[PDB]
Amino acid sequence: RYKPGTVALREIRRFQKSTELLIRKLPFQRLVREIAQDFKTDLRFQSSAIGALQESVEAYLVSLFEDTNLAAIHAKRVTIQKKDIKLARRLRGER
């Protein structure tokens, strides 16, 4: 058995230690089509364009998780909250 917090460090090491994609492909492709048909209907998409969208949102989300964790330590806490996300979005500049 393990104390609560050691296996979390083990899997956080495993997730930082690897390079695989973490988002399921078919829900993302469906999301891209359903978010694109409002702008222009009956569109066609390239597979590497979906891969580019995949890697862009992965990099954006993990960088967002860095500075929202920085907001979490700044408020003397561990768990992130929604005000940490709003603070990170405001201090990044966008609204």
Partner 1 sequence: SQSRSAKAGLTFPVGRVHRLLRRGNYAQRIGSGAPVYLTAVLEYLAAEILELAGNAARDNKKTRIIPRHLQLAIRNDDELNKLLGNVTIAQGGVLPNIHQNLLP
Q: Which residues bind partner 1 (CB under 8 A)?
A: 5, 9, 12-13, 16-19, 55-56, 59, 62, 69, 73, 78
Q: Which is nearer to partner 1, 33 or 77 (CB)?
A: 77
CB nearer to partner 1: give 26 or 78: 78
Torsion of CA 9, 13, 16, 22, to 10 degrees: -70
List Cβ neighbours of 43 (8 Å cut-off, separation of 6 or more): 33, 36, 37
In whole angstroms, the minimum distance from the beta carbon of 41 to partner 1 comes to: 30
What minimum distance in Å lies between the beta carbon of 16 and partner 1?
5
CB of 6 to partner 1, least distance (A): 9
As a 3-state breakdown, the chain gives helix, strand, coil percent values, each rounded to 5, of 65, 0, 35
